[PDB]
Amino acid sequence: VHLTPEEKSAVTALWGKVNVDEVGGKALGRLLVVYPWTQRFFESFGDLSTPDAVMGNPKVKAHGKKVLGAFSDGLAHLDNLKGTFATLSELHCDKLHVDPENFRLLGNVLVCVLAHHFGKEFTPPVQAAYQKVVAGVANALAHKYH
């Protein structure tokens, strides 16, 4: 993924302000609420019966931190997204059999969460840069399908 240097600076500046302990949870949580069928891959996580239950689920929050960390790993090596996500791709694709369109959906939910949290600061150009990043991450996680 190629971001202009101004785009990379804008992306990393905002990311440095993202709460490492909550944002991943809010994005994963919203994926489960907005695209309910994704709840199927997390049966062992417990209570996902209502939006509130999903958002407050300790396992959703803990797992969300791991998802966010992967995004951060992606941002630190934009020129090696496929290698960075290789093990993860095999896990989701060949093992968990998560359909690929769902990767794009999580990336977009993450963008919505960033907009919701940062308000006006999540400007259109900033969003444009993040879209390049989440598309790259989704394509890298789908790699074992291309």
Partner: protein, 141 residues
Amino acid sequence: VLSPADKTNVKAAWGKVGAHAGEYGAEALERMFLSFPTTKTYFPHFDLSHGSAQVKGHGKKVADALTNAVAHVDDMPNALSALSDLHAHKLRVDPVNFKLLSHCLLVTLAAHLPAEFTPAVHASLDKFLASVSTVLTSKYR
């Protein structure tokens, strides 16, 4: 298919747009044009510059169309038939573009209505825009 709660959710949230229709609509369009440049090809010769008065007026039409969709949420095809004539029959807009605009409208609402954009409301708005999208990209005459 929208649940009764989805309808209550959409009406409540979209009802806050009010006088911000043009502003919010314009912002969603600008987010789409910048994030997904290929969409600009449906608007050749439009002044698509930052702060463009043409985009602001267009944003108002899109937002007003959604207000119309909300006011006829249980019978949308009949309320949006002229927009289907335009997007499906005349312009032949590829459905992927509606997913891009819908996402940009959600991003815009999430940036402006923090109290309203709860996970449950977010889910209802996504479904609502997906339904509006299906109507506008379908030929049902």
